[PDB]
Each structure stands twice: as structure tokens, then as C-alpha cells.
Design a protein around this nucleic acid. Sequence first.
RNA 1: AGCACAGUCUUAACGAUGGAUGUCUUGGUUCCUACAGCGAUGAAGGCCGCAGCAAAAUGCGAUACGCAAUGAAAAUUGCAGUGACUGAAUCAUCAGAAUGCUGAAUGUAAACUACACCAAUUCCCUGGGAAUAGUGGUACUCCUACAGAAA
RNA 2: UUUGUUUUGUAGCAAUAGUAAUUCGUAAUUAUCCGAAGUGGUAAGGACUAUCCUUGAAAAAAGGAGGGAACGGCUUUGUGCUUUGCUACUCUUAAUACUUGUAUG
RNA 3: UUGUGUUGAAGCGAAAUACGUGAGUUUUCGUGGAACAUCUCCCUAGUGCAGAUCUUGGUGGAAGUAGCAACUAUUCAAAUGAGAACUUUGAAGACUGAAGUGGAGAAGGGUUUCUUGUCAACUGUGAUUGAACAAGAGUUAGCCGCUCCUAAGGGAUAGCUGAAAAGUGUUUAAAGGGGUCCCCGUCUCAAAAGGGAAACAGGUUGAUAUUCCUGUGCCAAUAGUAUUAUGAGUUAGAUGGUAACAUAUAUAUAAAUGAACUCCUUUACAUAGGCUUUACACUCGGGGUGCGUUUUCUUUGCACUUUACCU
RNA 4: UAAAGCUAAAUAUAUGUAGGAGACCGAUAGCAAACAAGUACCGUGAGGGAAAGAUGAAAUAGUACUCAGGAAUGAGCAAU
RNA 5: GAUGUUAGGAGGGCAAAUCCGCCGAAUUUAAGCAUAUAAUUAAGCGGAAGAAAAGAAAAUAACUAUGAUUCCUUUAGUAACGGCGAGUGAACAAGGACCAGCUCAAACGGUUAAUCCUUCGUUUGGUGCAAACCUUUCGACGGAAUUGUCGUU
Lengths: 103, 89, 43, 119, 93
Amino acid sequence: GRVIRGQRKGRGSIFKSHNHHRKGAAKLRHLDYCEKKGYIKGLVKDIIHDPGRGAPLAKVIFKRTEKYGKKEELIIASEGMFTGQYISCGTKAPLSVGNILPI
Amino acid sequence: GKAGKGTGSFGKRNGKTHFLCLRCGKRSYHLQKKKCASCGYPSAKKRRFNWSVKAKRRNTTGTGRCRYIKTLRRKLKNKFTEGSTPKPK
Amino acid sequence: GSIKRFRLKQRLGKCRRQNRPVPHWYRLKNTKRRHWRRTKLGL
Amino acid sequence: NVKAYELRTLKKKELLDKLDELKKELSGLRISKALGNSAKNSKIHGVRKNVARVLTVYNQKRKMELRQLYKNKKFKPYNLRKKLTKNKRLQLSPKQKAAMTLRQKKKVQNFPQRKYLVV
Amino acid sequence: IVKSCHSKTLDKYGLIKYPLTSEKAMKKIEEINTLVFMCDKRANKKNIKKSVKNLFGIECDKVNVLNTLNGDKKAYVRLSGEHDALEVANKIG
RNA sequence: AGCACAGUCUUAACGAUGGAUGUCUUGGUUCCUACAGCGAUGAAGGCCGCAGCAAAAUGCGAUACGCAAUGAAAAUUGCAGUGACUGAAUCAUCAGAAUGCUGAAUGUAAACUACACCAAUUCCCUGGGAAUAGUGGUACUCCUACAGAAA
RNA sequence: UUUGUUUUGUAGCAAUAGUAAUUCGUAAUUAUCCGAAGUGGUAAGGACUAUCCUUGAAAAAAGGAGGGAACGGCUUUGUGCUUUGCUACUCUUAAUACUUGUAUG
RNA sequence: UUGUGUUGAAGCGAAAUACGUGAGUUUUCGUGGAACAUCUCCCUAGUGCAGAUCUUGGUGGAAGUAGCAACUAUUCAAAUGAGAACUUUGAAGACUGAAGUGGAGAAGGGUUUCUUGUCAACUGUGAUUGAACAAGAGUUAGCCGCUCCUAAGGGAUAGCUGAAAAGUGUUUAAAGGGGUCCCCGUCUCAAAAGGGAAACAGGUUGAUAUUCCUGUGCCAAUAGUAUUAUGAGUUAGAUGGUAACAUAUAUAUAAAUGAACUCCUUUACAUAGGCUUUACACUCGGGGUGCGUUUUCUUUGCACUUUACCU
RNA sequence: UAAAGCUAAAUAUAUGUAGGAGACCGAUAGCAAACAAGUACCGUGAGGGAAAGAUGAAAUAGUACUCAGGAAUGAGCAAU
RNA sequence: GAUGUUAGGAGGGCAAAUCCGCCGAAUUUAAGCAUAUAAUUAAGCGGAAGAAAAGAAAAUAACUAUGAUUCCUUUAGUAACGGCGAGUGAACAAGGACCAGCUCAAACGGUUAAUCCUUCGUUUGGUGCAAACCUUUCGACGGAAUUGUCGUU
């Protein structure tokens, strides 16, 4: 016989993900001392649609603490967060919808 | 259909697969993958194969000009020392 | 086409120049002639 | 119609002047050549070979004028060193190839191979 | 590396080979006074321009360049209103 | 000026078409003999050029169907023109000079004659005049020295 | 210095270029060039509405900003700093002319 | 071994009161114009053709036959020429017909372009024609494109595998710039329809034109000093408006400071639907400039009147 | 006397070059190529790949002249 | 170690008939075919020379013994291997061509690293018209080397 359709998928020629318009990988903030010992609040500037997935993404701006500057993080938005709210990430973050907390 | 298997589709034959291949000069330089089908120009080697004595013989050494080795020939008989000249009259 | 590369145009000119007949004085003492419509120079 | 030795030694500046103007004269011929006249055509071969004859000496002339600056000095430029084949250049010199360690040197030197005769 | 021979870079004696005598080379001089000459393929605009103000005292409004199918370059030169381009035919021929 | 029927077939003589046969052979083939590599000092190969008239092949490289030198030794010739009356016309040899763009190609590129950086470079006379948008160097790996920085 | 009423202009190029009719050595002057509108064929723009379990590129390049390192001169003291007298001043656009390669393409 | 050849060898065509039984052999005539035998005996082999849908080449009957059938369609006169249904000119009849055998178009072609000459072959009839043949000539850009940017992606670097060839491309970047130590940071290629410095009109050639010429512009670039001016702001920087808003008309409306560091915006984006504006397109009647049926009617049928880039 | 190393001769050479030969082939043969042959030409490409020698001693004897034809050509009382 | 637009150098590619490593078939034969054979071949990858490779016994022999390697004659289609089928297949001695043998690894210089290389200068004389080349040696400088070069076998 010949190589079957499911077998040809791992080669990844035409079966690679159509990702031309994707906005970026949805990742939480990288672990930092500030996140390990308390809240750091980032402002969700905008809520975008990532073409691949059905879940909208949140463009959260965090003001970096090691240098002057802001940092953009793309986080999967929970249902209820809105543009302009402040989202607390860390051990001492209050337990509210959208906040990033240790489990 | 109308641009069928033969004559109809032969009308779509515009735009080329190969070009001049500055190393060989043959119209065998693949343009999409940028590699000569005759010698594999981007690779350092010459891309010969022992299963084609015709292909080996039509581009072996001596089929060209031999600008240097032809002059270097007929010198081992003379055994002249470099920089030497014949004695003046 | 109207737009072409320098090497291609130079080769076209050389192939045009190589298409003239043998000089009369030389003949008084050629086989590789192409027609643009008959045989394509493959460039 | 200039020949070898009448321009073999003449002053280099005058050489350059005459060479510069003779090519302008060649183009002056070319005016009429492109025009309806071709009556001067056969001497261009002689002028062209005189150019090579003058220049096979002029390049050699600049050659002495520049090599007498850098003569010898053990660190000859790339062109000035010997142009043997690459294998011959990279080969061991005869002295290095016949180099002989002190042990077998004192062997042979004191105790040579030498002729004889059998009756 | 020390080169002993003199440079093979092409001066005007080697860039510019001859002018044209084509009817097109004459008609524009006759009508609106634009001039035609011919040169080597490796020359450039200002390499050619150097001849016109190097061998001759004639103003160059511009030099225009063209690459012929025969392996040479055709150059065009112009003048300004200071100099008439009529004696530039009688003197040159 | 007169006569044959036509066609088809057969025979002979002479022709047409064709290129067999024979005879030629600056070619091939096989064997024997001898020498043997070339290349970053830029090879093989590929392009582009070079002749008064010059397409191919052959030869050559901006000195471009050939320069210099050496031996023989005076034509080149299709026309032109150039040559002694032997460094001159042509052969042969070929050591000197020169050897375009590429190509291992090696500054980055390449269906680009595109783009860099560093010495602005090179020529004239033996310190003063010019050419100029115009020369060389700069791959990767490795070896021997050297260097100033480091834990 | 404002508002209204009258005269010039095919709003400013612009007619003189282009085009056009009758004469006229074989070269010219001639005169017009006007009021307006009507259909929506094609393009583009604008403000909108709707659709998506489809949300419909990037970079070169350019701009704006927050911030406040540095901001008036001549000469004079000691060591970029206090200081003594006078205060005319500084930039933006266009260049003018000498100097580096020749300073456009 | 021993012969024939320019006083004509080999070969070839026709033949012979020739010999053999036969493969053949030997002669004659013609042609041929240079070599040829040996049967005296032997040695040797790529040594004998009617076939193999045999190989190569040449040539037949078919046969002056099939056929020269899409695209409605040609006609009269003249010129050239040896020669004209298919070359040119004039008249007519028609066609393409707004989605064109029309202008510009890319890919592909490569001189087929232009002028002159020309007809050996080709132009499946003719041919004086021609995209054929021959000799010359012709392609002009700061503004049109490439060149620059990045995309789908390609190559390569470090590594890591593999005998290598090759595979993959940060899998422990000690990897180029900025400002004045720090910050940032794989390289390179990939679009002549994506992004993008800046041009229009008129004219000109046998053949090029937003490239040449005339005029008028536009964009990018431009090293150190002494003169000028303009405008501003000043002895380190304005204006009003209850407001939105706006704010410098010198040749040009330039003239309201600014580092490191950072944050935005432009580039920069789908589809459908209608509404609207403007330019272009077309059209309408009476004004300025020409042709016509009219045995019969006519203010009669119709026809020629513009304005780029630049504010 | 292993787990280190070097070494010339006799040996082989369908390659390149240069010589010399042959009970070899004699232009459908012999190399594909006696010649402008790995050429013309075909295929996008890897590749495929021909045909084609002979006047004469001398063209430094290659057809002068005439006639008929537009010319090609033909004919001759003409010519190598 | 990193880094050098530091000084001096090497490798890359072409070419293969002979030669040296790797990798590696199948057609075929067996009248089928699977081990076997084709074949340790063809194709593929890499590396040298005028030759290469092998080569100075951890070798044969069993004799009255030979003495590096290679090649020729032979051993020999033999010993042996093998659906013991098809097929495959050496070695020793013997006769010849040729015939050269050697050095690293430990000891001692430790009353003197005694060794090696780089660079820069002088000169011992010379064949060559020349260009260049063969010889020449006082050195000095800078290194390498004691984690071991040479003297010593």
C-alpha cells in the first residue's frame, strides 16, 4: 500500500497550522520576585480575537519593575474582564475574577 | 476540459523552471530551489555520477580551454629555472 | 519581454551577432544560423 | 612607424604624452571611419602592435622602477616569490629530506658504503 | 601584492572610441542641436561626461547613456544657450 | 509533303533519378614504450571579449588570431597596407612581460553588472603638478608565535 | 476702517499653447470661443448599517509626545566654577563668496 | 612462388558458336582512369542472404488521386512590374461594432522593429508581398520600474546527528548599532500587481519618448567660515476666543528651545447593502464656424466650439 | 615477542600527454565524431545526440566570347 | 581558555586508468525459491601517489628446518565451505623477479635543556649577462620545552 492520510500529517507540509493572522502565544507573566511575594497590577488595554481559537485574548500592559518601561502580555481572558480594569497577579493578589493567583 | 491534458495545457507553458547557472552556463539552474540540476552550483563539488560516462566525458577536463595547464605542459622537458632567459645574441 | 537583465540582454545581442553570414571575401578564398521563429536559443 | 629601440629608452613623460595623443589621433581616424572614408585602415594594426611593443617595455619599465625599491629583503611580495607548482612549493627541501639524525650520521659518516672487487 | 604594470582602468582613450555618423546622429544636431557619440560598455555617466569637458570646451547640459545590443554604449551630450551647437558640426565633421 | 490508333506488357540502345561498387584516407582501433597530477602564487570548467574588412572552428586576453627574447630566416597577401636589400615578413622555440568577468570563490549578494567597511587610492620628476565616484584589503576552519582584557 | 450698488476676468495657469472656417507671396492675420442644464455609465471619496464558531499581513520609513541632561555674549582673577565693567541678543528660510576630492542626481 | 598494368588496372553495363552439372570460371565490346592478381603450396577470418512486422538509405503503384470547406464578400479603374484574384492608390459594397483582428497591457519570444534593396528557397494557389533574404540603423530617465522593506518561505551561522554525503536551524549567541558605561540586537535572500521621495503639458523621429526639445515644477542630498536679509522669540522662548476652535501670507505662512530613557500614531488592510459628493463619460435647446435628398414639404437632414502638473 | 611508527626495489595502470608499431577497419566500417563532433538539433530538467570525405596534374587552367531570353538558363560556327 | 581586518602559514576545488578506506544492491544461477550465488561486485561517500597499499614476525613449520613485504610459475580447482544442492575455495613448502633495513617507548647530561623554533643584522666562496640559486655563520633577540627535546643506546 501507500502512506495513509493520518500518516502524512506528521510530515507537516500542508498540515502545519494556518497561523498567519494569529496575534501571539497566550502566556501568563513570567515568574518574578514581585509576583512571588505580592500583587503586581497590569491594565487590560484591549480585548482581541485570535483567529485560531474561540476564546478572546486580553492585551494586558504591565509596568516593568527592573527598568523604566511597560510590557505587553497576551493572556486568555476570563469571562467578565473588561478594557480598563486592573488585574492583580501574585501571591498576595485579592481573590477576584481575572486575578492571577497561586493555586 | 478545454485546457486539456495535451494541446490545451501546452498553452499554459510560460514562465521557466531553470535558468543559466553562471557556473555551468547551462539552462539548468532551478530558480525556486536555487540549485543547478547539471552541477549543483551552490554546493562546492561538481556533481558528477559514474552512471553517466557521456555526461562525465562532455564536461571533463580538456573539453574546455585549459588556460593554465596547457602552458604548464611541455615545461618538464625544458626544466628551465624560473626567471631564466635565453642567452642574448 | 521589455524588461530584462543585463546578462540576458548581452547574451541576446551575442546570439544576434552570431547570426550573420560568412564574409564575402572569406568565402571568395555558415551552418549555425538560427531563425527567431524556427529554433529558440533556449534562454 | 616607430620600432623597438627608438622608444625603448625615451623619457617616460614623453612616452605618456605621445601615447595619450596617438589614441586621440586613432579616434580622429575613427571619425572618418564612421564617416564614408576608410582609406587609413591598414596602419592601425601597425600602431596597435607598436603600442604592445612600447608597452611590453613600459610595463617592464615600471617593473624595474618599482622592483629596485623592493629588491631582495627575504619578504618578497606574493607575485615576486617563485611560481613553482603548489606541490613543489609545499615539498620538503632536499636538505630537510636528507636530514639525518646524529646516530645514523655517526654510523655512516665514520663507516661508509664503498666499492670493492671480487676475483 | 605589488602590481608592476600600469593600471588597466579605462581612461577616455578606451572609454570613448568614436562618435556616430548616423542620420539620427546628424538630424537632431540640424534641428534642435543635441549631439551623439559612442563609448565603451564599462563607462558610466560621469566617466563619459569627463571627456566633453576634458578634451573640449563645450558646456554639458547633460550626458545621456544607452546600452546597445552590439556591446557598446551610446552617449548623448547637450549644450546650453551660451554656445551654439552649429560649429560643433563644422569643426568635427 | 505523307504514314502510323491509344493504353498495358516484354526486349535492346541511349539518357534521368539514386548513390551502390571499385580505388583512394592528414581518421579510428588495439598493443608496446616513457613520463605524470593542477589549485587561494587563484585550478578544471563557464561566460565576455580580441583581427582593417572576421560568422564558426583554431589561437589569444585590454600588450587580446598576438608582445618581448632565442634559432631559422625575408614576405604577409583574397584586397588593402606593412616589411632587409637582419631583434624587421613568416615559421619554430618559448624561460621574460602580460594574463578581462567568474568559478574551490573566499567582504555581503545574485534571473541584481546591487550593496558594504578599512587604508581615500594611483601616476608624473627625484619636496612640487594631475586622474579621479576612481585601486588593494576584509570568508570559514585550523597551526605556530604575539597582544591587551578575565577568576 | 466695514457693509451694500456698478466696471475687468472663460477664479488665479488660460491662450498666446492646442483645435477649427474663409481669404491670401508661398509666409499670415482674420473672427468666434455662450447661457445654461439633463441622464447616471465608470471611478474615487464620505458618513453609515449589517455579517462572521471567517475579525480579514508585516517591516523599511516618517511623525507626535511624556521627561528634563544642556541655554544671553565681549574681556578680565584664581582654579567647566564665584567674581569685577558694558549689555544691545539668539535662532529659524533663502542664499552670497574662500576652504576639503570636483560638493548633485 | 610469378605475373598483368597509361600501349589503360580494379569496378560497372551489355554480351559469348566459351567451359562446368553447379556454385561459378574465362573471354568480347563499351565505359572507366589507377592500381590488380597468384589455382604453386599453405596461413588466416568481422568470409557467401530473399525473408527476421530485420537496420540504414533510396524509390514505387496508390495518384495528378484524397484534398487546399470555420471566421457572411467582394467589385470597377489606375500604378509598378517580365508576369497581378490575394503588392500599392482612388471609387464602391460590406465587416469588426462598445465584451473589437482598437489603444496601452505582463509572462514568453529576441531584432521579428525602422529604412533601403531584393526573390535561390519559404510565404501549402499566385506573389512584384512578407514576421523570408541582404546591407545599414534604431531603445537617451534624479521623477517610469528594478534597486530598498518585509510575507508565504529559501539558503546559511552556532551547535547537534551522520563514515561522509547530508538533516535541523538557538536545542548552555562570549553575536553588529545607539547614545555616553549602559541599552538594543542571528546573518542573508525572497514581491517589475503588497509597502514606497519626487513630473506635467505641448512638440519632435523612417524607427525612442510623461526618457529627446520648449516651458514650467517637484524630491532627496549638500563639509568648515565672513556677509545679508526676513520673520519671530528674547537683556531662557506668543495669541485670542465664556467654547469648540484657531493662531507667522517674508520670493516660501520658517521663525511658540531641548539629551538619555519611554509611550503612541501613520505605513496598515475583510465582505455585503444602499445613500450621498465630485471628477470623467454621455446628452439637450437656442449663440460662432461647413456639406444635402427637395418630381413634393421645409428657421430644412446633419456637421466643427479645449486647458496638464502648479494654490 | 601483540596492543606505537617509517621504509626504496621487483608490481598495476579502459586516465592525461608524448612516441612506435599491427596478418586490425577502409566513410551504413573504424571512436558517437576522417568534416565547423559531443557540433547542429530535441527535452523544463537529469539527459539524449546525428547526418555530412573524393573535380582536376594544375583552378597561379573553375568556364572567356556570341546568340536567344526579364531572368533563370539553353545553344554555338566560340572556349580551359 | 575567548577575541583578533596582529605576524607568518595550511585545508577547501578539479582530475581517476592503476591505488586506499567506508557504504552497499538487485538483475542472474539454482531450470521454482527463501540460505546460497550474483558479490565482500555495480551504484553512492570520502582520500593519495607516480605508483599507492604492504612490509621487518606475538611468521611458518615439525624438517638435516626456513627468515620483512610485494609480484610471477606452482601448490590448486587442492584442504575446506555449501538446501554438502547449484556453486564457492585458500594457505605452507618449492622454483624465480627484486632484495637495506630501521626508530619512537625506560638509563645516564641534574657540577648546568646539554635540545628545538621565530626574527633581525655581518660574512665562506661560487657556478649564471641577468633574474635567481647553491653554499655560508658570528651571533643577538624573542620564545617552546622540566606535564620531557636532544646528546645515550
